[PDB]
């Protein structure tokens, strides 16, 4: 009766996907600003 990890696995997948998305967004902004500062 104790609900298992399979009952809430999808929310874990969503959480890790959101973490990866935030990392990607931050890194893309950093690369864009690096290129802009190289130009300027």
């Amino acid at each position: 009766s104790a609900l298992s990890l399979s009952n809430v696995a999808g929310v874990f997948y969503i959480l890790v996907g959101g973490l990866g998305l935030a990392m990607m967004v931050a890194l893309i902004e950093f690369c864009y600003k690096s290129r802009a500062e190289s130009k300027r």
């Binding site: 298992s4 399979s6 696995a9 874990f12 997948y13 890790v16 973490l19 990866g20 990392m23 890194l27």
Partner: protein, 166 residues
């Protein structure tokens, strides 16, 4: 700075070795199966009390996708690869003292390796759905050490850019 680099290198080597040992060994789960008490890893199941000869785990649309991901063990292997890449970045940054983006790359690799470890753990437990052996906890400790080393590498990156600011 040198002490931080030493901690980062030792932790990077420790997490990588722990994850490699966990992936290689077969003490992931103590359960009962072919009808004997056995211990299984990611690839082989062998009996405790034949005492030792192993079977390849019979790993076989959402259920099919989960079984394929579990069978390939893509996420623990990817964690091993990312830890290796982080170590390579640490070594290259030791070679190239002026390129600070290598430290950042190493930190990103370590954090990503930890995240891949989390995904692999969740996939393994769901596919299993007993007791957990020392390979499971080796992988968990590898995750913890990888996240600590990633935090420390990000700290080194921040400190170096702060030093350039002044």
């Amino acid at each position: 700075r040198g002490v931080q680099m030493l901690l980062t290198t030792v932790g990077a080597f420790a997490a990588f070795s722990l994850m490699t040992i966990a992936v290689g060994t077969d003490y992931w789960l103590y359960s009962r199966g072919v009808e004997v008490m056995t211990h299984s890893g990611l690839w082989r199941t062998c009996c405790l009390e034949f005492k030792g000869l192993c079977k390849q785990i019979d790993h076989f649309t959402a259920e099919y996708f989960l079984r394929a991901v579990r069978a390939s063990s893509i996420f623990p292997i990817l964690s091993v690869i990312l830890l290796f890449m982080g170590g390579l970045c640490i070594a290259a940054s030791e070679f190239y003292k002026t390129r600070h983006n290598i430290i950042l790359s190493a930190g990103i690799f370590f954090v990503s390796a930890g995240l891949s470890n989390i995904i692999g753990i969740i996939v393994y437990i769901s596919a299993n759905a007993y007791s957990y052996g020392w390979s499971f906890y080796f992988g968990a400790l590898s995750f913890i050490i990888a996240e600590m080393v990633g935090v420390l590498a990000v700290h080194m990156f921040i400190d170096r850019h702060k030093q350039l600011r002044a």
